[PDB]
Structures are given as structure tokens and as C-alpha cells.
Design an enzyme around this catalytic site. Sequence first.
Site, PDB file in Angstrom:
ATOM      1  N   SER A 262      13.387  -7.295  37.028  1.00 21.00           N
ATOM      2  CA  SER A 262      14.135  -6.360  37.853  1.00 21.00           C
ATOM      3  C   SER A 262      14.240  -6.801  39.303  1.00 21.00           C
ATOM      4  O   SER A 262      15.304  -6.679  39.915  1.00 21.00           O
ATOM      5  CB  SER A 262      13.478  -4.985  37.777  1.00 21.00           C
ATOM      6  OG  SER A 262      12.218  -5.014  38.420  1.00 21.00           O
TER       7      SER A 262
ATOM      8  N   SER B 289       4.709  -5.241  41.877  1.00 26.79           N
ATOM      9  CA  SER B 289       3.495  -4.695  41.304  1.00 26.79           C
ATOM     10  C   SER B 289       2.440  -4.524  42.377  1.00 26.79           C
ATOM     11  O   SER B 289       2.391  -5.277  43.355  1.00 26.79           O
ATOM     12  CB  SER B 289       2.895  -5.590  40.218  1.00 26.79           C
ATOM     13  OG  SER B 289       2.359  -6.769  40.792  1.00 26.79           O
TER      14      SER B 289
ATOM     15  N   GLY C 160      11.993  -6.591  30.600  1.00 22.80           N
ATOM     16  CA  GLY C 160      12.796  -5.567  29.960  1.00 22.80           C
ATOM     17  C   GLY C 160      11.937  -4.744  29.033  1.00 22.80           C
ATOM     18  O   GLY C 160      10.871  -4.265  29.431  1.00 22.80           O
TER      19      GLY C 160
ATOM     20  N   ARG D  74       3.119  -4.546  36.841  1.00 27.05           N
ATOM     21  CA  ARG D  74       3.303  -3.106  36.938  1.00 27.05           C
ATOM     22  C   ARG D  74       4.199  -2.689  35.788  1.00 27.05           C
ATOM     23  O   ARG D  74       5.402  -2.965  35.805  1.00 27.05           O
ATOM     24  CB  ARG D  74       3.930  -2.709  38.265  1.00 27.05           C
ATOM     25  CG  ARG D  74       4.131  -1.233  38.424  1.00 27.05           C
ATOM     26  CD  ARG D  74       4.799  -0.956  39.749  1.00 27.05           C
ATOM     27  NE  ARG D  74       3.939  -1.215  40.893  1.00 27.05           N
ATOM     28  CZ  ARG D  74       4.367  -1.215  42.151  1.00 27.05           C
ATOM     29  NH1 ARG D  74       5.643  -0.979  42.422  1.00 27.05           N
ATOM     30  NH2 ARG D  74       3.520  -1.453  43.140  1.00 27.05           N
TER      31      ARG D  74
ATOM     32  N   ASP E 157      11.399  -3.925  45.954  1.00 30.62           N
ATOM     33  CA  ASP E 157      11.058  -2.784  45.124  1.00 30.62           C
ATOM     34  C   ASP E 157      10.780  -3.213  43.687  1.00 30.62           C
ATOM     35  O   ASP E 157      11.309  -4.214  43.194  1.00 30.62           O
ATOM     36  CB  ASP E 157      12.173  -1.742  45.144  1.00 30.62           C
ATOM     37  CG  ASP E 157      11.716  -0.381  44.643  1.00 30.62           C
ATOM     38  OD1 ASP E 157      10.520  -0.228  44.314  1.00 30.62           O
ATOM     39  OD2 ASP E 157      12.555   0.531  44.553  1.00 30.62           O
TER      40      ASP E 157
ATOM     41  N   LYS F  50       1.893  -9.967  31.115  1.00 27.46           N
ATOM     42  CA  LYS F  50       3.250 -10.358  30.788  1.00 27.46           C
ATOM     43  C   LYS F  50       3.366 -11.834  30.437  1.00 27.46           C
ATOM     44  O   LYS F  50       4.417 -12.259  29.951  1.00 27.46           O
ATOM     45  CB  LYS F  50       4.188 -10.002  31.943  1.00 27.46           C
ATOM     46  CG  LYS F  50       4.391  -8.501  32.075  1.00 27.46           C
ATOM     47  CD  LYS F  50       5.402  -8.131  33.145  1.00 27.46           C
ATOM     48  CE  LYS F  50       5.613  -6.621  33.192  1.00 27.46           C
ATOM     49  NZ  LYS F  50       6.241  -6.093  31.946  1.00 27.46           N
TER      50      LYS F  50
ATOM     51  N   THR G 273       8.914  -5.593  37.857  1.00 23.13           N
ATOM     52  CA  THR G 273       8.803  -6.786  37.030  1.00 23.13           C
ATOM     53  C   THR G 273       9.652  -7.917  37.569  1.00 23.13           C
ATOM     54  O   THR G 273      10.879  -7.835  37.614  1.00 23.13           O
ATOM     55  CB  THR G 273       9.212  -6.513  35.587  1.00 23.13           C
ATOM     56  OG1 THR G 273       8.401  -5.459  35.059  1.00 23.13           O
ATOM     57  CG2 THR G 273       9.034  -7.763  34.748  1.00 23.13           C
TER      58      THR G 273
ATOM     59  N   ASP H   2       4.191 -10.349  37.579  1.00 22.26           N
ATOM     60  CA  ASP H   2       3.687  -9.149  38.222  1.00 22.26           C
ATOM     61  C   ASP H   2       3.525  -8.057  37.175  1.00 22.26           C
ATOM     62  O   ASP H   2       4.343  -7.937  36.262  1.00 22.26           O
ATOM     63  CB  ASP H   2       4.627  -8.678  39.331  1.00 22.26           C
ATOM     64  CG  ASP H   2       6.068  -8.530  38.870  1.00 22.26           C
ATOM     65  OD1 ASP H   2       6.432  -8.994  37.767  1.00 22.26           O
ATOM     66  OD2 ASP H   2       6.867  -7.911  39.604  1.00 22.26           O
TER      67      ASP H   2
END
Lengths: 239, 54, 220, 107, 240, 230, 191
Positions: free
Chosen positions: C129, C169, C47, C19, C166, C33, C1, C17
Site C-alpha cells: 500500500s 508499521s 494484499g 502492521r 501512511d 510477511k 504494508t 513492515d
Amino acid sequence: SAGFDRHITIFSPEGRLYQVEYAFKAINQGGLTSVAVRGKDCAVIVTQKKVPDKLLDSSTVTHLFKITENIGCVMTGMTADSRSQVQRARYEAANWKYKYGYEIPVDMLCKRIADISQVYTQNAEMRPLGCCMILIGIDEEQGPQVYKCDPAGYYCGFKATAAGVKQTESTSFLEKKVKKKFDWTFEQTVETAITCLSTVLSIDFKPSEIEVGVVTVENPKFRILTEAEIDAHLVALAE
Amino acid sequence: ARPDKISGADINSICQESGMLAVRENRYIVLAKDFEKAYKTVIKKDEQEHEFYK
Amino acid sequence: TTIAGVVYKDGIVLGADTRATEGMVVADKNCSKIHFISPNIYCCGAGTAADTDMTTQLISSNLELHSLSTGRLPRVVTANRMLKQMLFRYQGYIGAALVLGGVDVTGPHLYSIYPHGSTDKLPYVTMGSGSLAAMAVFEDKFRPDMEEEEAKNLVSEAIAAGIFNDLGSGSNIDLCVISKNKLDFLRPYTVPNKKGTRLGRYRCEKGTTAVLTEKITPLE
Amino acid sequence: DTLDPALLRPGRLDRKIHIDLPNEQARLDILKIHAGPITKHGEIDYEAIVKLSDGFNGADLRNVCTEAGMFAIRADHDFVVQEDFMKAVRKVADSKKLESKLDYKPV
Amino acid sequence: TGYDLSASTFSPDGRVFQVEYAMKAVENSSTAIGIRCKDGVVFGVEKLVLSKLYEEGSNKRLFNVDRHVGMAVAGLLADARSLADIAREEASNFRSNFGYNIPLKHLADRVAMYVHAYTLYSAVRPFGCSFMLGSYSVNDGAQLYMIDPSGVSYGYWGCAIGKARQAAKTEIEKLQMKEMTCRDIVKEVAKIIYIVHDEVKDKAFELELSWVGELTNGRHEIVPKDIREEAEKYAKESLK
Amino acid sequence: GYSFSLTTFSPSGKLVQIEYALAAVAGGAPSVGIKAANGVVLATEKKQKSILYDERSVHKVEPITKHIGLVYSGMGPDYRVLVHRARKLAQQYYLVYQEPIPTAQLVQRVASVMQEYTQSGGVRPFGVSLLICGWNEGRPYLFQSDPSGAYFAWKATAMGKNYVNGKTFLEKRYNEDLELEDAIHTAILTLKESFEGQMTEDNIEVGICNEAGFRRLTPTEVKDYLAAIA
Amino acid sequence: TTIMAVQFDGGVVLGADSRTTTGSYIANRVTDKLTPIHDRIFCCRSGSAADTQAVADAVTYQLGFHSIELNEPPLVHTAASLFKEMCYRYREDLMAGIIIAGWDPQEGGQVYSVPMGGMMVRQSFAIGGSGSSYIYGYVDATYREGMTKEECLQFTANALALAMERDGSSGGVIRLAAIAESGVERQVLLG
Ligand SMILES: Nc1ncnc2c1ncn2[C@@H]1O[C@H](COP(=O)(O)OP(=O)(O)OP(O)(O)=S)[C@@H](O)[C@H]1O
């Protein structure tokens, strides 16, 4: 008719209720006159004072109540209802400023005051605050506004506005005066306010009796005039 | 050709309204003044009182 | 994210993104999102997903209520004040990493909200993230008053770097552009990652599984 | 209080009219004609009696003249002094205030 | 004449008769006046002994709300005591929340809203009180306000509450009020109270005088009236 | 001299304080609303008392959501209250189900609210009769409620002054199958049957409900349409 | 982080860094760390961010409502008392380094300090923030009683310069605020 002695707020036969239409002349026991005018990028309130005493002060007889930094108002009717209504207005403008992050528009304030009056009207066992309230304010993308709030909770708002004792006559002059399509170059507004009260009451008096509240899209702050410039406008309209 | 319904007693009151309203000005017949004065006097503005609750 | 925000010469370009991992396994390949708030204001979340969802639906309801009560276009600062007051009222229990963006009468306004209730107005933010890679691309290649295609290419580059780093998505980076007049919303913007074709037909047959008890129930 | 709507139609009450109380200068009128049969000095403040009393009645100014004449009968004077007028203001305008339901219009 | 029962109902002409009856309730009470000078506010209350049963020093209507504010009540006494306690509580909230002395305008507005809140509903009656409020401040000067039973609160130089409300302010206003310090105004109030009703309907009365201003350095207290004894040696010279 | 108040039945008849509120509704400003084949047309009658008033401040035709229109015939100060209730209530439904509320469900819940004020015994009823409409699931609807808590379903109806006369014109003029423009034409016809003589772009105030959503027309298109529509 | 308030004869002078950090990562590079409440009164914050934002908004609410009801410009000590009550009442949950300063018509320029506990004191100068210990090292060295405006600006410039240079959390850019009888004059300096 009644008959029902109109003691509480119920519906009578054919078909009205009598409490609110007795409250509509609780304004008329005030002995007071208010006129509002919107012509152009300004807006003018005019209201006299009835001070028979020399022992009584002159500063604290003011009916123009600066609600917020861009909103002024004037009150008629009995004084206690008016002042309690004013502190509710101030409190709710501050609640707007807390919740929504920006300055309240003058429309929502009139809506909220009317709704409070309706709740005081819908549920019984409270007197429905028999005072009438006229608001003014500047809004972006709309210019100035003039609104009226009823004790019943019926707000509306419009160009030339008058409430108090003698305002069937004032609205007769404002129909006979706001029908010609001239512009309103701010001293036209001040002159028409002074002369409309000067023709309804027919007194033509000192600058120390009326109170003048103006707001303009050059200084969006609410502004109360001084004796000197009121005198300047009064002899400036003296022809 | 006007609406704003006006009954027969109300019509005759308009005619006598206008006729008296011109003869008190020492005239011969109304020159369309007092007919419209009879409208804007006689209707007579839905009362005043109250323009709340409609 | 990895969500991001930016202010070009007229409005705001948002990216995301999609995922939605639950722990260590990819649970979703397409998760919206970018959420609705108003005809002019949108929002992105990060989150805890359901907290952001329920909160953004509540605040969008409240602003729809307020806007229909008022009779004109909403303001972004009101959304900001409601969100920060709500998230401070939950004392930071609710984890909702939000990006708030809209265009008012005053123009475009971008806010990022950290889930305790600390908010900031910025020309560009990254949240999530893998936000660090997108913030790298922003701090490298930002200039004031970008144009439209320039800003779109920049935001795409940032989320692309977040995906090549890392926890990005598999998804085809979602974008959204808010102007003074034209609202756009583009789900399948660019698909960089085609899935490899299957190499054998590992299809079962009509009877390869033992059946113990059948039932048929007709309908209308 | 109880009157006919058919009384109120054009044709039987074709015109009607209203009267104010005074306009405070008709106060001056009713006082300057009520300041009639009174021996004085010619110093009687009309503005003081006009503004300080609020009777809104030619009969109230009649009572004013009557009791000011009685207060020239009191203290033994032929002339009614301006202070007898203000004694009339005080006494008459206070006994005036022993009334309720000061309003009347049918329908 | 109605329709006079509840404090919520209106009349066919639009006023509340409960509030009117409470306004003329205070009319029978004792005469209490007040006046300010250019550096202070002086109170004075015509107080009467019942017959011979008092103690000359009980139930003083000159209250003392804050360190610089006191009341000069007239009307029903216990209701005024309750209202004085409410005013003490409001000055307590202001002192506790903002750390400085209450401005008299805000205090008077809160008290007026409290009185109005007792005039609104039907469960309660309007107050039977009418009182005076004085203050002094170094950045504000002297302020004298006035609260009716309804809740209309605005400012004066001088006032009077009681029977001789008109009959005091007839000759209050002939005072050259600005150019005098309050130490003159003490014997002025003494002579004004001493003028009204020496012996006619009642037998005897007694004077109390409250006193606030710059001379008390912002304090509010009763005068040492026995010091300089300024009424009687001038009251006996005021009969001629 | 009875009934008085809201807690007790009559000797044989009904609830007189509800009957008086219905009479106060019937003594109100007129209105008309017509369900056509594709859309619903609402139209009111909004006269300023003087020449001073503005026509941009108060609005009679009022949306509750983006696809649900609502007018009344009564008192604005209660109208706005129950409007706000319907707003908050419809948004609560949309919070729960993430779906725009059906008009029947609005009418159920608003009727529950109005019924709760008709319940005993200190509050008065609303002096307001609604006309609720919306385009839910293809078929458009039209729902009249009342102060008593009841509700109905109309093809075309009226409320206010001369609702009987307007209804006898609606029964004669209107039918089941028209389009929205012909519905507006017959709606301005039946309002022009009963309104005052000066009917302009501001004395009326007309909103429609397409299947594409609610639409509140402007004085521009009202003046274009009512430029002697018949 | 590092916040500073210096009064002088005419008025007061404030100052802060920007650099809102979380752990070792900078979340925001440039920040309005000082906040307007009234037209003549500022506050600059430290500690947690959300706490100070919500407290400053509620103080803005109460003070604006109170100052409209007085129909007089508010005092600075009043706002300091409001911060004192709200800080002390929830000392269990808030981390506020609120410093109140501002010009007043009755009392001139004043500087009050409210640390994390909830005590209130009037000072002639104040530090604040985690990287404030150092210029607190020499603010009792360089200070001279009776500075001018330009001396206060140069003083706080050197102060926030050295604090930003040394502390890891501090840095960014220098924001200033000058409050006097005339006006409020803000500028963004670097050096
Ligand atoms: N068709 C008509 N043509 C001309 N004038 C009419 C006509 N109908 C009525 N009028 C006028 O209206 C009056 C009607 O008679 P009215 O005296 O009004 O009856 P009324 O008794 O007063 O009403 P009620 O219900 O009987 S109490 C006539 O005298 C005319 O002036």
C-alpha cells in the site's frame, strides 16, 4: 517351474515373474546392436542398419531419434514400441518445458519413462512396451551423461553402455577396454566405438551402414553425422 | 583369505580347472595365473540375467 | 504494508513492515510477511494475507517436492512459472501481490507478481500500500552493483519512508539477505518507536468485581 | 529340454563349447565345399547364394545343390547354371520357411 | 503354438503370435503395388471380379484421404475403410488446427501410433490391413510410405502388398526409377500387374490405377485409364 | 495349480500370491538397520554387475523429508513409486498441519497404500520390504513394513539374502545401548558377514538419522570409516 | 504499449516501447514487450499483460513440440494460426494485440496481425497498442514500398519516437528486433 504358464503378471513360486524376463529378448528379436560411450566432454552413439533392399530408403531407417534440442537417443527392439516410446519422451520433455520454465535434464526424463513403464507393468492388461532406450545429453556442472532405460522400468546410467543382441560380448570388450586410465580425446571415443562394434560383429564395412550420433560440450545440440565425416573418421582409425 | 564363499566341490573344480588350464598350455604347475583365471571363470558372474529387481 | 526488493552486487536484500490492519484498526504489531519457499528462494506477500499464505505454502510444498525429487538446488524461474500459472488459473479472483526472490546457479533473480498473473524481472521493485514512498527512495538513490551495507541502508531507508508515510508499521523493519552461500533473516532490525511509559497504575484489585457462580476443576 | 545340473558340473562336463551358425564367411566355406560335385561353368556367384539365401545349415546347402541339380535335370542340361542355383534359392529357401520353433538350448 | 490367444501375452521366445497371424492374414489378399517417379507417385491394384456379380466400379481399394493423399489398401476391406476414416479425421484435425496440408511423415506417424494402439491391448485385435500412402508437394517432392499390420512405418521408392510381394519387387527394382516421369510409370505399373497371374488360379482380374504428382498440380485422383488405354495395347505386347 | 488370483482364499492356508512376493523380497539384496540410543543407522549393499556402472545415479538410502530415512530390500521400480507416494503424502500432511509428519503416521499411510494394492484383483503386490526410520520427538524409531500391508517395530533387523544369518549376528552383537558410530561399526560388521568380498566406499551406501536431522553420508566419510573398521 | 512490425525484402523489423502502466501509475519502466517463441519468430503484445504472457507461453509449448516432431523449422503462418485459435476460443476473456512476424526459409519475412477479436490477416506493416493511432496516422504517409534494413530501422525509430513522445502511456525507451535469414539482431536505442 511353470507350471503357471505365465499368462498374466503375477508372482510365481521361487520367486520371480516370467513376463518381463520374456520381454528382455523382445529386444533380441530386433536383430540390432547399440553401443554408447562416455569418456570426456563428448558422448558417442553407434548403431548399424540392416537394409537388404535397394528399393528401401536410407534416410528413414535412422534409429537415432532427436528427442529435444540437447537430447538424442537410440532405440532397439521392435520398432513400434520404440517409436511410441519416443513420442511419449518428446511429449514429456515438452511438458517439462511448459511446467518448469527451463530445459529438462536427461535424468528426470529417464525416471519418467521408467515410471511409465512401471505403470504399464504394475497394472495388467497392457503390453509392457518391449523396447530398450539409451539416452545421451549434456548437463551444466556435470558434463555429459549416458543412461539406459529398461522395458521393466529400471533406469541406470554410466560410462560405457551397450544394448541389443550381442552385448554380453560388447560389455566384455568394454570391461577389457575401459580399464586403462587414458583420457578420451573424442576421436579416441569415435575410434573405440567403431572398433568395439567392429570387433564384436567383425565385419569392417562401409561408412554407409552405421549411424553415428554425437554430442559435445562445444555444441550442446544433438548432432547426426554425414557419410563424408564418418568415412573420414573410419579411414582415420585405419592403421 | 578370500570371501565369496566357495564349497568343496567348487574348490576341487577350481583346482582341476586351474591344473588342466595350465597343462593344456604344456606347463608344469600354475604360476598363480590359472587360480585367478579359475576365480574369474568359475564364480561365475551372478548370472547375467537379470540385474533387475535384485 | 510496504515491501521492497533490490539486487546488490551478489544477491537480494528484502524488507517488510508488519502492521496487519483489518480495515481501520491496527490488528497486529508483528506479522511475518517474509515467507519461506526454499533454502535459497524467499517471497513476500501483500494484499489479502491468507491468500498469499496458503498459496506460498502450496508453492513451497511443491518446490520442496520437486527439489527432493531432483536432487539439487531449485530454480527461481520454476517458482515464477508455477505462481503465474496458478494466479492466472484463478483468473485474478485471488488477490496476492507477491515479490519473489532467490539466488540460483545463474545468480540472483527478483520477480514481482501482480495478482492476475503479470510478472516482471526487475533490479528493484516495491509492492504494497505504501510502496510509492519506497519507490521514491529507490528511484532517488539507486546505483548499479551496490555493496552489502549500502543496500541494507537503502532498503531500511525506503521502508522507513514508507512507515513515516501512511499505513507503514509500528514494527521494527524486517530484513532478509540472500547470497550465494549465506542466508540471513533478521526480525528485530531497528526499533525506532519506543512506546511511551504508562503514567498511572490503573490496576484492578482482588475483589473489585462481583462474581455470581464459581467453579474449580482439578487436573493432572 | 530336461537335463541334470549335476550333468553341468566341472568334473563331468569340465569344458563346454558353443557353435555359431555361420559367421557369413563360414557360409562361404560351406558353400565352397558344397560347390563340389557340380558340373558348371565356374561362374557360380557365391556371394549371391551366401547373402540371398539364409538357411544356416550344411543340409540347407545340400538341398540347394540337390534342387539346383534337379533344375539342371529339368531343362535338360549337364551343367548346373547359376540361375539353377537361384531357382534353388527361391524354391528351397521358401519351403525352408515352413518351420516354427527355430531355437534350441537346454537350461 | 501356445499362448497364441491374447495380444498382450508374450511367448517363451518373445514375440506376439497375434501380430504374426495378422501379418500373414494380408498375405492372402489381392496384390497391390506402388512406385514413385521423380515428380509423382503411381498406384496400381490387381483387383479381381468374383464371378459375374460385380458391377466394375464398386468397393475401390484406392481411397482418397486428403486432397493430395490417398490409400492403396490390401487386406480386410472394412478394417481398411475404418482406418481410412481415421486418417481422414487426422488430416481434418491438422487442417483445422494449422491451416495447411498435412506432411506425410507426421500423418504416417499418427496412423502408425493408432495401429500400434490397436496392437497393444487385450480387448482388441490387431488390424488385418496393409496399405500404401502417397503424396506430392512443391516444396517436398514425392513421398511413398508403407504401414504393416504391426505399425512399422518407413519409406520406399516402390512396394507391393499381396500374394506376389516378392514376385513383383523382383522386377520392380530393375526399373530406372529416377529418370522417368510418371506417364511412363503408368504403363510400367500396367505391365507389372499384367505379368503376375494371368489365368492360372483365377479367371479374370481388373486394373485400377491411382495417380498423384506434379502433373495433377498437387491433386490426387484416379487416372483416366480409358484415356490412352495404355495397359492393354501394351499388355497384349507384353506376352511376347 | 491354484491361487490364482487375488480374489479367493485357499482351502485352509493363506494368500499364496502374497507369500510369493514375500519370497521374492527374501530373494533380494541384503540390508541392515539398527536403532541406537541417539540415532538410527541404515546400510545397504549395492553391487554393480559390471565395472561399467556408475555409483552416483541410483541411490538406495533415501530421505522422505529432512528427518526421515528409508531403505528397502526388493525392486527399485516399485521402490521409487511408493517413495513418490510417500513424498506426496508427507507433503500433504505438512500442508494440513504445518508440522513435520511423525514416522508412525507415515507407516500407517504407506501401509494403507500397499494394502490397497494387495486388494483385489488385477494388480500385483510390491516386491519391496521397507525399513523406515526417523527421529521424531526425541526418541528415534525404526519401522519395518512389508508387501502385505503389515508393519512392525525393530531395534535392529535385516532383509534380503541371509537375513536369518545377519539376524543371528544382530542378536548376538548388538544391544540396546550404543552410540551412532558403534552402531555403524556393528552395521558394517553384519553387512560384511554376508556381503561379497569386495566391499568398498561404493558397494555399500549408508545414511544416518541424528536428532539434528537425517544425514546421508558420502563416499568420503564411508571410505574414512570403512578403512578397515575392524 | 505501442508496438510495430515492418517487413522488408530480406526480413522483418519489429519494435516497441516499454512502460507497463496501471491506471496513471507506472508499474514498470522497462519491459520486454516483444517475446521470442522460436529462434526465428517473435511476437509483440498489447492489451492486458497476463493474458498475453500465458497465451505466449502456451503457444511456445505447442509450437516447440510440433516443430520438434516435424524435424523441420516451423512456419510463421502456423504460429499465427495457433494464436488465432487460442485468441478466438477465449475472446470472452482475453485482450490480446498479438502481432506475429518472423523470417522463414520457405516464405521469407512475413507479418501477421491478430487484434482483440481473433481475426488473422497478413500485412506488409502493422501498428498496435493504445498509442498507435498516431503513427497509424502517418504510417501510410512515410512508407515507401521496398525499403532497406536501415530505412526500416530509421522508420520505426521515428515512428516509436513520435508515439512515445505524444501518448501518455507510451514512452520509456525503444527496443528493436531485426529478423532475417542470417540472424536476430536486437538493440536498445533512444532518440
Ligand atoms: N571336505 C571336503 N574336502 C574336499 N573336497 C570336498 C569336501 N567336501 C566335498 N568335497 C568335494 O565335493 C564332492 C562332494 O560330493 P558330491 O559328489 O558333490 O555329492 P553330490 O551327490 O554330488 O551332492 P548330493 O547332494 O549328494 S546330489 C567331493 O567328491 C569332493 O570333490
